[PDB]
Design a protein around this ligand. Structure first.
Ligand code: AGS
Ligand code: ADP
Ligand code: ADP
Ligand code: MG
Ligand code: MG
Ligand code: MG
Ligand code: ZN
Lengths: 483, 310, 394, 209
DNA sequence: CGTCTGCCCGCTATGAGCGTTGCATTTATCAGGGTTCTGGTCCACAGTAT
DNA sequence: ATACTGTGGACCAGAACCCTGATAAATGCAACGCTCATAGCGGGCAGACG
């Protein structure tokens, strides 16, 4: 409900010239840096290491939600969705006439006069209805949720008493129905607008045709930018009716409404639309941007995307016995462990720290990752090996699989972390020592030798001169050690 | 369905599905398929059934029965898995758990029965009495329905009557006690009964879960076994000892009852095809008869041990 | 619909030593503790006496729904129902191979359409029958909802896969048509279990002959314990040939199939039974038991009396109020509670916060007029005068 | 389950596993024609809103629903008019989906319960019961059996309204009389000018206003 | 003896429950092609006759 | 010690099949039609007086 008054910027492109709907959108001149600025990450310092193990457990449990590293396909999706959004308003020009007036005027001018040739090709919808098919667990929903939220939803105009809804989101559920999408569109329009359209239009008495007929009216009345149907994978074919008639219903949806529409699905749902996809026919449309997991190798060498993501994710570790450099063996092993699927790669790293905080030594080993793999990836054993096989049928059959209820399992991990008796020697060292900003030198030089002499030496220097900066403290503690 | 009967000890799943419709007064053959599965195009098969997993979801609240136990302990799949090959054995389960039916017989390229050969419904005169006295019910059993030998491994010969699986493709039939079971004078070939007794323990044996010797392994094992006690001349097949052993232990009428004529005059004989390097799947009959002829004091499981180890 | 896993007892009687069905129930209780278990009352507490009037009115009005007291006969009824629901499982044992014979025979009756067809002569059935005739308003339905509430309804086993249903209750259709009893038996096992037996057995147009065998085999698909039939008087109102048809089918089921059945009805339904089983007759309570006043009436009156919710009330009861109750109500168990609740409601609403005989008389004569004509016959006591009408003692 | 183990092991001697519904009570209101038995009900029931929608659950609460009897008098039109009066308060098509001609009366009565439990119906008022005294209903005792077998509907206390011609003809049996006056039978009368030789303040105030 | 003005009763009108029937529906029947299958082929290779 | 012959492994190619689409016939099944029982009704007959 960000009801900002329309400030009309000027775009130098001739097609977007003097359109009240388009100009209210944010400008696009440095959007490449804006598109690459989606990156977000937690801020971690060395201070959080000496905290109690429950605080570290909470910090680790907070990593999945607030970590995002843009990749190659995100730029392409951002540019394509920008093109679809901004090219969708060349038809519904409010200041001049609509499309039908333009065609009628063109016919009247080509009849007599000297307008020799007029092309009646017009616009197919207004942009192609993209179909973003990809394997489940790859990260489509979060990508759209972030790259589609940088546009204000409602631009309340002043001279025209209309609402410029820029985007929208339908979402099906488990064992859905064909009429449920039509009802949910009306229901979800209320949350975006604050009205009560369900009371007057959401009656169950209406047939399937009347729902689309009213949707056309309301979509024409409010200047609509996009309509993102999501999670077609959840639908059940037999409950709604004929499976092959779903394609007819979706084509009818695309034709009647007229605004750009973008569906989402999994390779299981591909067979519904495969009839139109195989043909190169213009008018079928439904262009597909295939989502694929991260590939390890490129031109016989490791792909830069994989290492770039791996190092960035590996910088978030707060292990006590941690070494600075990632070993190559684990780099080799977890890719074959997880096949590069975007969701589970992060999940294995999340669960590894929780398991290592309780099993004993605080480090990362290949056996630990293997143990986590047999622990909490049981439902996804078939799909992973199907991806390893490479046969399209094996991948298609085992799609839509997801691990249930990981969040509840995280809570019992934390509860088990809470109840422990024995302590590590480093825990003893940090507890007995005055670790109030004096800890940092000890931590940075702990691994050089045994700390038995180190614990009183730093105290001796610090009591010798209580007022020091750590910057001057480091040369002195280094000098007294070698003696 | 709310009350799916649990399979008895050592019975086929076809009789279990039949008793799942005998127990609730469902007499229309269409409604049984409508309720058990939900599709009117599903077929009825004796041995190597498909659509399993739907039959296990009904028994899910009982924690014991699962897909693997159902296929290995309650089908005729144990006879084909060890001998054909390891990878085909491992992929048959994933091909069979789902709705695919045509590929099941094709991929296990031994089920080219064409016309239904001895797919008439069979039973045993003496076993039914024991089943009646200890249970109170009668059912089809895996011991009766050996693919080739029409003999109960313990005793006697099976009672053929006149019906077939192709008479009704979409009908599951349970054995009827009131349907008269009439005895006939037992005409038994003792060699066939001995072979059935020899081959019986392989059906229920835990070690047949994963042991499938490889094709090249089969070739080396057979060459070494032939050369151990002198069944092969210098780079030549003797052709005489192999014939005289099998003629000593087996007579010709047993072979014609098994439809496995030897052809010493003709160059193309299955016995010579076995000893030459293998390239296709072989039936259990040929391996069993070769094992019985070459060495008569070794069990099937330990025979597979010696075959697979070296 | 309370799915409960089963854990077995170890019974003492040798006849029940093997069954899981009869060893899954909670144990039968001695008559000493059974009387105390049935009783329930209201929480009361004196904190509500000084609260507002409206908040007190609903607490007063909640008396008839949450107040039950065990009388003399209910302790006999509980024992008889326990015996008659335990005696119907000794002939359907699944361990020793008896349910399989009782269930295999039922397929033959479905095939041929006759209920006398038998395949195994060794199959023997044990069952009992009862009828519970009582005057209307005597609270006989609530007795069969509180005695038969100790046993859980649906218990799920795990060695087998049977989902046993312990008790089921149906209501005969008002017209008494021979198809709707069979179509309503598939609508109690349809809700108490969460299934759709009705769609697979009722919509397909079958004859009554096959629909009768489908019931008798589906009831043995599970382990049905009790089929109690309420409101049996409507059976007399059906067409010709149906009055005897389901007075013979409901004795065929008890004798042959082996599912116990109990029938409950009004006194005017006794004629069809006698137009040709243990009989228990229920009568309205009376104070004049032999030569001295009955103790049950006094005890019940005191127990109900201690539930008053009036700020200024007489704690001790007077005998004149008891005589007024017995002369205005005649002891039928419905009138007393409603009369007392209405009297104290009017007392609260008027402003006079204490109950008197005059207020009872005024409320009875002003608010219960549709009920007076029948009570005149009960008050008079003349056998010929009381013989008219229906639903009266005969 | 815990009570079940406690009663199986002998610690607990009693438990209440499940209790069915026993909260169905009715009432009848009869008064002379023209005394205002309907405009004194619409205005009382106009304070409670009909349809209540809860976010936490997924049920719609229909507080009350008013049916009127037809002009000739039979049970089937009442049964179908329940559906015809239910599909208007909500947005639905129950009449064409369920109200077919194949179903008998008993099926309709057994089918009303599912809808009366899907939406938490609170009150069902039947007025103009006058028309059902004598008609082609198949029998007075059969129609009375219908009105008493209307107990199997799940709870939903009902209120019946009729002229004083309905009482004597319609309640002439103990088992049905005790269900009509299950919560007191309210009787109405016209205003009396002289209470006890003193003018009534009610009449004076009404006439003056 | 007309007529008369209200009675009846064989009748008409109508609810209640069940039973065919055309209708859609599924099922069953026939021509055809190409494909994997297995039957038959052969050819280098290894071991003996001159 | 090399030409002659068996021989095992690798290899062409016709053939049973068998899968599928186009078309006619048997058929189960909601869709009215029918039947049965039940309650009120207006022309007809006995009646009866001035
Ligand atoms: N022994 C009792 N103790 C307490 N309250 C009782 C007792 N018997 C009956 N009641 C009350 O009386 C009412 C029971 O009446 P119902 O449940 O209608 O049974 P019923 O109407 O007598 O059965 P019918 O007439 O054969 S349908 C409830 O309000 C009970 O609280
Ligand atoms: N760059 C990223 N960094 C961390 N996690 C990511 C990233 N991209 C995607 N994810 C993961 O993807 C998950 C959501 O995507 P997903 O569930 O596959 O979409 P859908 O629900 O449509 O299948 C999130 O749990 C998130 O952890
Ligand atoms: N308290 C009142 N004051 C004035 N008019 C009233 C009152 N009660 C009822 N009426 C009148 O009575 C009429 C409604 O009568 P109604 O309830 O339909 O009678 P019935 O119940 O016999 O159908 C209304 O027109 C209304 O004007
Ligand atoms: Mg998603
Ligand atoms: Mg009752
Ligand atoms: Mg009115
Ligand atoms: Zn036998």
């Amino acid at each position: 409900a960000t009801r900002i008054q329309a400030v009309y910027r000027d775009t130098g492109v001739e097609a977007y010239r003097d359109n009240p709907f388009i100009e209210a959108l944010p400008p696009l001149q440095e959007s490449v840096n804006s598109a690459a600025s989606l990156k977000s990450s937690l801020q971690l310092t060395s201070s959080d290491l000496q905290k109690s193990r429950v605080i570290r457990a909470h910090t680790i449990c907070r990593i999945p939600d607030d970590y995002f590293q843009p990749l190659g396909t995100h730029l392409l999706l951002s540019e394509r969705i920008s093109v679809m959004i901004r090219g969708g308003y060349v038809g519904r020009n409010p200041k001049t006439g609509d499309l039908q007036k333009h065609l009628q005027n063109g016919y009247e001018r080509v009849q007599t006069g000297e307008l020799e040739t007029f092309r009646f090709e017009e616009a197919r919808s207004t942009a192609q209805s993209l179909l973003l098919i990809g394997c489940s667990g790859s990260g489509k929903t979060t990508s759209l949720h972030r790259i589609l939220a940088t546009y204000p939803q409602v631009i309340y105009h002043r001279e025209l008493n209309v609402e410029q809804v820029v985007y929208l989101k339908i979402d099906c559920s488990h064992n859905g129905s064909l009429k449920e999408i039509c009802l949910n569109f009306f229901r979800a329009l209320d949350r975006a607008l604050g009205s009560n359209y369900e009371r007057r239009y959401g009656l169950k008495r209406h047939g399937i045709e009347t729902m689309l007929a009213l949707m056309s009216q309301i979509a024409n009345a409010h200047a609509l930018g996009l309509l993102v149907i999501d999670e077609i994978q959840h639908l059940s074919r037999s409950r709604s009716g004929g499976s092959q008639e779903m394609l007819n219903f979706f084509v009818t949806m695309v034709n009647i409404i007229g605004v750009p529409v973008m569906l989402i699905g999994t390779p299981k749902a591909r067979e519904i639309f495969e009839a139109d996809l195989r043909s190169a026919r213009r008018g079928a449309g439904f262009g597909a941007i295939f989502w694929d997991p991260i590939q390890q190798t490129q031109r016989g060498k490791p792909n830069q995307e994989w290492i770039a993501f791996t190092d960035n994710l590996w910088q978030l570790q707060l292990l006590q016995r941690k070494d600075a450099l990632l070993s190559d063996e684990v780099r080799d092993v977890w890719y074959e462990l997880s096949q590069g699927v975007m969701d589970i790669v992060v999940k294995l790293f999340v669960l590894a720290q929780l398991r290592a905080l309780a099993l004993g030594n605080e480090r990362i080993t290949a056996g630990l990752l293997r143990q986590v793999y047999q622990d909490e990836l049981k439902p996804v054993h078939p799909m992973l090996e199907a991806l390893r096989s490479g046969i399209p049928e094996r991948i298609a059959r085992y799609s839509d699989l997801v691990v249930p209820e990981i969040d509840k399992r995280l809570i019992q991990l934390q509860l088990d972390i809470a109840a422990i008796q024995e302590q590590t020697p480093e825990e003893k060292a940090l507890q007995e020592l005055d670790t109030e900003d004096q800890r940092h030198l000890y931590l940075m030089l702990k691994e050089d030798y045994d700390s038995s002499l180190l614990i009183p030496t730093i105290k001796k220097a610090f009591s010798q001169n209580p007022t020091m900066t750590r910057q001057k403290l480091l040369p002195l503690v280094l000098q007294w050690l070698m003696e | 369905m709310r009350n799916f009967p649990v399979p008895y000890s050592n019975e086929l799943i076809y009789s279990t599905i039949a008793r799942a419709g005998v127990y609730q007064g469902i007499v229309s053959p269409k409604q049984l398929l409508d309720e058990v599965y939900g599709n009117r195009k599903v077929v009825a098969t004796l041995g190597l059934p498909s659509h399993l997993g739907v039959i296990a979801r009904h028994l899910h609240q009982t924690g014991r029965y699962a897909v693997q136990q159902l296929i290995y302990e309650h089908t005729l799949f144990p006879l084909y898995a060890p001998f054909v090959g390891k990878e085909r054995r491992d992929e048959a389960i994933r091909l069979m758990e789902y709705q695919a039916q045509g590929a099941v017989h094709l991929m296990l390229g031994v089920a080219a029965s064409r016309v239904k050969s001895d797919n008439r419904f069979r039973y045993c005169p003496d076993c039914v009495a024991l089943q009646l006295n200890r249970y109170g019910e009668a059912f089809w059993q895996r011991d009766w329905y050996l693919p080739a030998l029409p003999y109960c491994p313990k005793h006697g010969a099976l009672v053929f009557f006149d019906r077939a699986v192709d008479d009704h493709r979409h009908q599951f039939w349970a054995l009827g006690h009131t349907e008269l079971l009439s005895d006939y004078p037992k005409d038994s070939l003792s060699q066939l009964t001995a072979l059935a007794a020899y081959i019986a323990p392989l059906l229920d044996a835990p070690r047949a879960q994963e042991l499938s010797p490889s094709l090249e392994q089969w070739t080396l094992f057979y060459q070494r076994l032939a050369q151990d006690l002198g069944l092969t001349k210098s780079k030549h097949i003797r052709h005489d000892l192999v014939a005289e052993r099998v003629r000593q232990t087996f007579s010709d009428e047993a072979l014609e009852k098994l439809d496995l004529k030897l052809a010493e005059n003709k160059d193309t004989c299955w016995l010579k095809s076995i000893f030459r390097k293998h390239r296709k799947a072989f039936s259990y009959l040929q391996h069993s008869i070769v094992w019985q002829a070459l060495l008569p004091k070794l069990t099937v499981i330990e025979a597979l041990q010696q075959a697979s180890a070296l």
